């Protein structure tokens, strides 16, 4: 179904460079379970609207699912579905306990008050409580969703599983007064962070103090890279780019000033001290790494001859496509695939859910020092078998991540080949 | 959704009936919830082979969800859904405490083995086990599914739940040796029988006996309604028919004499003493009762014309096209509405239900004449309706139903106005 | 506790005409379990604001606790735990296999909307879930609450459980849309006409066909009653009487046409077929029959002496005190306790309890049939003991009901002498 | 509610101090659920008895509510709950992930034998079985209840649970055969240990190595305490006293030896290695650290002139008046107050939980590290609010406790300002 055509087509792909039944192949392809429901809003004009919602868990062999919420009037089934299936894979490739699992609601949010949002996530629990448990499924946020909706949909389900469950641990992305966890917002640019820093250590660097990153996007991902790799690594962040363009100088940019300039003016464009680019400009500079952290489907078929990083370290999702992968690799480029590199995020969020049920809670440090050790693992896991075949990094990362999944169900007896 | 579709024609349709507001309407289109699961059976060959099932909770303000599993090659969810959004309509003009609900697998059942089945079955239970219950959703044997289907799904039921619910009443369609019901075979015919008995009454009928009806059909429902018509009303039945072709004889038939004909046979044609007609022709016979009762769209604008029956007892599902609706109305000949004349069957579910949730099991005559009280009851609701508002059967059913529905959405608040 | 103090009074006086242990005294004079809980409502001026509200449960060694819930500004907790009590003693005096409840939210449902209102009853219910179900505690409606509360009530509590219990079981009083009884409007008046039935019967009484009545209330209960006695009896009555005033008619009046009269006018007062009289007077009328369906204490020492009647049917609660008990009893007036005469409402609502967690709905004609034979039973054990003890009515009716529950706590080991 | 009202007022002082809605302040000032039952314990004469008891759950919004069990012939429920909402502040101001609760029952413990006693404590758990959970209500000892009562009643719980929930979880306080945690004992006094080492440091103390500290009670808590302060700080413990009086010795009294003394004797008074002092005096000496660990309210408007220490560790609930807290905090005396100083014991109560939920026990030095982390976080969070806002100490834990618990119900969603 043309986004979730799109996820059968990378399993078709993966296999090619592994072994897997026709059996196992065929339980991949479909989700294990999905449920459909209509949730009636109380209006604040005191009429009720219906709402279509949807949650979807693709595969549980390796643990409870695990996956956010997203909030959007053009939402499909379709595009849940795929989405589900991917986070299957990226639980795998980090190794955690957990499934893949995604939801939906098929709604213009910014025509909802507060209350009615509030409503609409109650409602959501409600009609899907029987299928979901601090293990079984649990959501998180995504588009249009976040930790106050998160808050929301916690607190209708303990009221409803009446406290005899750890209730906290029914869903992540939470605020801290109950129950979150410290290190949500850098998650994924600390996760990122890591895998660069063992790209480059592949790569045989002599370290990344003053070399150059030019990150694609200055949202959370992206301010958190300029950041990180700024006063962390030493690097040496030249170039940044939003919406409306980006920014170039050879010193290199500071952050937090880029940050407040885009604040005040609506853009990263026309900051003091440096020259305007486009785009299409930030992703050809002659960079030792290029981040794209803002929408996918930059590096493709026309520019991929002239990307000029010699890592590119995907932020966002889907940014490079398939032909500019196939360029990328004969190029000599080392690339670090999305659902590896910007997993920090999940990897967060499952700390969060230990924290939850283990009702202790943990400091900065330490969900960064965990962080890091998980991040290196799954660098490794990927980078080995790529060398180990000689493939492409994303191929590789589909291999580790379907070989762990299929090998839990075939444990499990789900399939007998 | 072409099927699913068609369903929201009626509602509009009865919407023109009656006052209901746009709130409930909406809410009447969408059902509650569903769910599509992956069901992964072990074939008989020692591989894993999955198949694609569903339930549809279209509605349950009235009461826990009623309806059947098909097992069809062809199956799809908007047909379920649109079987769903019937039953609501069903278990509303019966007057019962009950919902909608319909399940459907994508299966070719004759290629299955019969333990290739029970593994199908009872996967189906644990698949959606978190969305059924004795006062929840009762599930029953529909297309190609039969007592034995539902003998391996309570089974498997009442493993997962543990003996600590009413087991038996997870699904009704049992057999007799684990809580099925005395009358379940004759229900549907028995059912058709009082209708026609109340209708020869509305109508000035002196008596059934003597009077004559023609059965498009001669399985279960033909056959029965044959021989009940006959031997309790003292009916004369002239004319009925199979597949292969109608038999006529002016002076009745022995509805078992010509079964077994049939048997032996395989088509009532042929039958010794009769004359053999089309089913076409069969259905113009100049008869007092006509009952198609096996299947749909047998009389149109076509024939509607040539109908010369005073009552036609919609046996079958949907015989008679809208078209056709009009013109027989016009002609002044009275429609006994399929959902409520052969409603007959899920109202003595119900009952096996009662029996198996108190645990005290019912004779047949106790069975019997429950079934009466209802079925003549719902027959004047329908039919004073019909009257007072001065409109074809059909449309008083549907507003009998939705009025219902409606009123139960409202005292719960599920719709404000 | 002056109410609550006032039961311990009535407790410690069946104590003197029976034999009971002070363990069982003791245990009795304290309800086993009481919940109170702060319920916040958000109100429609967006802000939250919180209530309070409780549940009693007095005893359940019959079997489930069963009692209304009131809404009123002034309730407290005294009140609910002596009404509580009190329910403990009239479903023993039924022998209904319950115990006694009650609950009580303080608020003005005056100044609430229906949103609020909606709000309010679902909040009770999200707080107390614990501590109710089909088989535990079963509330119904009572001042200031209704089916419409009801119905919300059963609604919250059916998303909160799932539907994995019989939902429509958990409350009564509910609508018949969502599995309400037949009878629940006359219940009352219906109940008090047999025992009337009986009274006269062991008063030797020829037939009540004739005899006369004076109704003090013309509410529901004094409305049906009016009904009843005169079209089902053939009494004649007399004299009707509201808050604004008393008509008087030696010929009978018309139950339906005064009800009329009142719905224009808003009093009986004024009827053109008949002549006013003071409420006062009502009570002092020369009649056979005399039924306070008003208020409390209108019989007291200062008029008991002028009271005329040959049977006084208590349907309200406590319209006669216990000094005018003494001397009616002295002059031979038969009077039929409260607790016994409007038993019929809470009978009723233990066969809305049946019909709904058997699944199968009663008839009028069954309702009323099965109402007659608890009521004439209730009757007889209580007049017996009266007699062979020569004792008042009222003390003979909490002997029966105390025996009962002293016993049922003796046989589960509760108490041990 | 005299106790109750003084919450009321606690409450209304920290408002002053910081910015909340009434909406919040009239939710809190409300417990969430109170549960008051009667429990019937068969005596060993034979017969049975009745008891009344309670559980108060004040506030859940950060977690399960935490709190003791106090059985005292005095108890009441206005007590009950106003230690209910004590616990709220002190869970809180410590970051813990808890509310606060609390229990009692009205009985002296003295007069019961063990098999009463053991007997009584099942017999609440039976009684409120519905409202308790290891994620939902975890109580302790407290008031003539200890680690035997506890382990009755996690018995009784685990009995009725049927082991499908973490049992040991359910209470703490629990003996270590089953469930409790290394460093109990120790926990106040250690707890308190770690706070006067940072006020020291706060004062710029040098060290606290040869500095005074004088100790009003030698229970538990001041046992431990002058035990630690001298062995593990190199205090000198000039003083120690007990309700017959007190010791005084410039160079130091050996703790160990001193508890001897009063084991044998049943006073510290007399002890031959020092000379006598009185209560009164030991108050005023002139020492660095004073640490009233006995009872409450024995700084007043009377003495608080002559309070000569530079820190107050207030190690019993409340030993300073509010009055005397103006004069020390313009005498500059820095307090400690009570809920932080004290707060080792729910902390350590707190670690055991955590090792019974994840089934997983900790080494007395895990214990003690973790302690040291979590009281050195709370001192800070309160004395940076009460330097920055230069208020009194006591005022600054309010703020810190209120605020946080205020968050998480404007997120939960329970207020909406």
Redesign the interface.
């Known amino acids: 179904a043309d986004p979730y055509e799109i996820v059968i087509k990378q399993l078709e792909r993966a296999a090619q460079y592994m072994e897997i039944s026709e ?1 196992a192949l ?2 991949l392809k ?9 949730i ?1 809003v ?1 209006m604040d004009d ?5 709402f ?1 919602g949807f949650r979807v868990q693709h595969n549980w062999a390796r643990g409870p699912t695990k996956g956010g919420i997203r909030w959007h009037p053009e939402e499909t089934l379709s595009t849940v579905k795929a989405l589900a299936a991917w986070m299957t894979w990226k639980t795998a490739v980090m190794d955690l306990p957990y499934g893949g699992g995604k939801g939906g609601i098929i709604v213009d949010p910014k025509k909802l008050s507060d ?1 009615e949002k ?1 409503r609409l996530a109650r409602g959501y629990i ?2 899907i ?3 979901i448990s601090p293990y079984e499924d649990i959501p998180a946020p995504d588009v249009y969703t976040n ?2 909706i998160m ?2 949909m ?2 209708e389900y303990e ?2 599983s ?7 641990g029914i869903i992540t992305g939470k ?1 801290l ?3 979150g966890s410290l290190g949500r917002i850098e998650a994924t640019a600390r996760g990122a962070s890591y895998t660069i820093r063992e790209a480059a250590k592949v790569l045989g660097w002599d370290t990344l103090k003053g070399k150059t990153i030019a990150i694609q996007g200055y949202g959370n991902a992206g301010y958190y890279l300029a950041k990180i790799m700024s006063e962390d690594f030493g690097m040496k962040v030249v170039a940044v780019s939003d919406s409306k363009g980006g920014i170039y100088n050879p010193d290199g940019l500071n952050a937090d000033e880029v940050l407040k300039w885009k604040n005040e003016h609506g853009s990263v464009k026309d900051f003091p001290g440096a020259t305007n680019i486009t785009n299409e400009e930030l992703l050809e500079l002659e960079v030792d790494v290029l981040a794209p952290a803002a929408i996918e489907e930059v590096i493709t078929k026309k520019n991929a001859d002239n990307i000029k990083a010699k890592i590119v370290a995907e932020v966002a999702n889907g940014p490079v496509t398939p032909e500019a992968d196939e360029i990328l690799f004969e190029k000599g480029i080392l690339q670090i695939p999305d659902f590896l590199c910007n997993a920090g995020g999940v990897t967060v969020s499952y700390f969060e859910w230990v924290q939850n049920i ?4 943990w400091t900065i440090e330490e969900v960064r020092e965990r962080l890091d050790k998980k991040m290196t693992k799954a660098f490794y896991d990927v980078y080995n078998i790529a060398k180990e075949k000689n493939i492409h990094m994303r191929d590789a990362a589909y291999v580790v991540a379907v070989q762990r999944v299929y090998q839990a169900m075939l444990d499990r007896g ?4």
Chains 1, 2, 3, 4 share one sequence.
């Open positions: 059996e065929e339980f479909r989700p294990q379970r999905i449920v459909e429901v209509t009636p109380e005191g009429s009720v609207k219906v279509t209350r509030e409600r009609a409580y029987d299928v930790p106050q808050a929301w916690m607190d009221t409803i009446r406290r005899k469950t750890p209730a906290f605020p007064s109950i129950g283990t009702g202790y809670y789900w399939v007998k080949h």
